Write a structure and sequence with these properties.
binds zinc ion; 2 domains; alpha+beta; five-stranded mixed sheet
Length: 543
């Protein structure tokens, strides 16, 4: 943890104790003694929780908290503590690349070129531009999660979140090396593009390939069956382009419009290419105002559904990001005509099924947005942030999750909520927003009822058997990956059995197991890691 921020140790049990000691491990000296807070029952975990507050101790070092007979694992106080996990999480995207060979000396991850057949992936249906079965080059991009499919909604939202991390602290990222393996992104590296932007461009390049001539965007690339726990270069079965959706077309437009702004200082032609693509997508959407989600039978036989049959929050993001990037006030008129509700409220954490906050963030940073409506959107952000602070401040684990929030992707949700707190802090600075955001990083790294980090490679306990075909087939730790997190609703055979057989029933915050097949809680995905990168950006030391 950081010298200038709050410092609590959360203790489950230990009801009979009254005091704690913070001990410097190098000297054995007690640097701080205090009284424990009162024990309070935590609904989501079933734990009775108290905490040791030593925030006023600011000296860097390695320490342990003693309570009664027990002493915590060593932990650090230091300004530099979040730089390493930020770097690991960001470079994990490089290690997820598809269509290239990877030989990474940092982790030892090695694989041959994978999914070369994506250069001729077959369209699963007939459309005005391709006969069914016709090949399209949709190579490149990132493998989505523990599988090797590539999906526009999560690709666009993850890329956007990473670009917002760039925009939060460009000077941090200009001097941050991701130790890109040999052979990767050679033209971009020769041009001196910052490593984070090199990596994001690999995904944007792929997203561009998913757009068809009329501006609409296909849904995903995958096979007709799920591969086993095999290296990606062994997944030789035919690959297809599946689906067509307006919500994904709009997310593509948002990501491309954001990329146009982000890349313009570096690559004027590429930035223009992104902006023109974003506008073709927006024009498709304006001419096709009703939502579409195409479903052909079999398209989910080897890949996830990522189904949304409405699209308002994503159309709003597309228009608002275009407003921000282009300064064309016609987008403000369009937004005020169709999306006035999102200018007055409805803030919610970013995820692939709801990008309202990406749109609100774009709007409040748009020079040509109406000033009174920008004020309204700032108030929507602060109302949501204030709610998160209220929840976390009264929660024994300082968590922004409620008992009913332990659904698939809860760890993403915790970090998406932290992201929202940081965006609120940007428009209306408030130390409570910063501190509560940082509390979700403490939670993510293991200060939680499950007793484990949900980011690989970090924490006394962390996921060692993530549902991840590359990790499993190569037996190589890839640090920095965020797994779904505790999920009391089930969805895989391991969790389904645990939840149905347990008596007493499992408490939602503990509905997690570290097993290869527990994909409803233990699978990492690009859109889980992305908000973690964003949040850690704020707290990482520059140099
Ligand atoms: Zn691949």
């Amino acid at each position: 943890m950081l010298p200038e921020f709050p410092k609590i140790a959360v203790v489950a049990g230990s009801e009979a104790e009254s005091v704690f000691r913070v001990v410097d491990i190098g000297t054995g000296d007690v640097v701080y003694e205090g009284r424990l807070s009162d024990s309070v029952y935590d609904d989501a975990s079933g734990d009775t929780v108290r905490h040791a507050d030593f925030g006023e101790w600011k000296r860097p070092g390695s320490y342990s908290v003693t309570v009664g007979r027990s002493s915590s694992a060593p932990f650090r106080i230091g300004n530099d503590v979040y730089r390493a996990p930020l770097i690991q999480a960001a470079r994990s995207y490089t290690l997820a690349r598809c269509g290239v060979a990877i030989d990474d000396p940092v982790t030892g991850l090695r694989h041959d070129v994978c999914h070369a057949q994506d250069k001729q992936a077959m369209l699963f249906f007939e459309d005005p531009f391709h006969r069914q079965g016709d090949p399209i080059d949709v190579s490149g991009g990132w493998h989505d999660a523990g599988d090797y499919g590539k999906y526009v909604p999560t690709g666009a939202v993850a890329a956007a979140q990473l670009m917002l991390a760039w925009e939060m602290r460009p000077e941090l990222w200009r001097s941050l090396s991701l130790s890109l393996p040999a052979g990767l992104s050679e033209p971009e590296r020769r041009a001196g593009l910052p490593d984070l932007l090199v990596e994001i461009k690999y995904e944007l390049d792929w997203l561009l390939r998913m757009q068809r001539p009329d501006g609409a965007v296909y849904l995903k690339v995958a096979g007709g069956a799920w591969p086993g726990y095999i290296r990606p270069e062994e997944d030789t079965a035919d690959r297809y382009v599946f689906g067509l959706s307006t919500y994904g077309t709009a997310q593509f437009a948002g990501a491309a419009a954001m990329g146009a702004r982000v890349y313009a200082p570096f690559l004027p032609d590429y930035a223009r290419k992104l902006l023109d693509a974003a506008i073709r997508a927006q024009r498709y959407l304006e001419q096709h105002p009703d939502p579409e989600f195409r479903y052909d039978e079999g398209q989910n036989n080897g890949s996830g559904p990522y189904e949304k049959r409405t699209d308002r929050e994503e159309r709003f993001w597309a228009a608002a990001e275009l407003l921000r990037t282009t300064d064309d006030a016609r987008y403000d008129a369009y937004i005020r005509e169709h999306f006035s509700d999102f200018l007055e409220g409805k803030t919610s954490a970013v995820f692939w099924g709801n990008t309202v906050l990406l749109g609100q963030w774009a709007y409040v940073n748009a020079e040509r947005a109406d000033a009174d409506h920008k004020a309204s959107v700032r108030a929507s952000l602060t109302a949501y942030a204030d709610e998160l602070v209220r929840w976390a401040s009264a929660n024994g684990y300082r968590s922004v999750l409620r008992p009913t929030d332990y659904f698939w992707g809860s760890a993403r949700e915790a970090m998406g909520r932290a992201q929202a707190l940081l965006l609120a802090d940007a428009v209306a600075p408030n130390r409570a927003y910063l501190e509560t955001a940082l509390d979700q990083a403490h939670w993510l790294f293991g200060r939680n009822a499950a007793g484990t980090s949900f980011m690989t490679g970090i924490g006394m306990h962390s996921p060692q058997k993530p549902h991840h075909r590359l990790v499993a087939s190569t037996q190589t730790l890839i640090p920095g990956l965020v797994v779904g997190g505790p999920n009391a609703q089930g969805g895989d055979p391991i969790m389904d059995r645990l939840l149905r057989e347990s008596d007493p029933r499992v408490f939602p915050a503990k509905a997690y197991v570290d097993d290869w097949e527990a994909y409803s809680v233990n699978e990492p995905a690009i859109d889980y890691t992305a908000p973690a990168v964003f949040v850690l950006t704020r707290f990482a030391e520059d140099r």
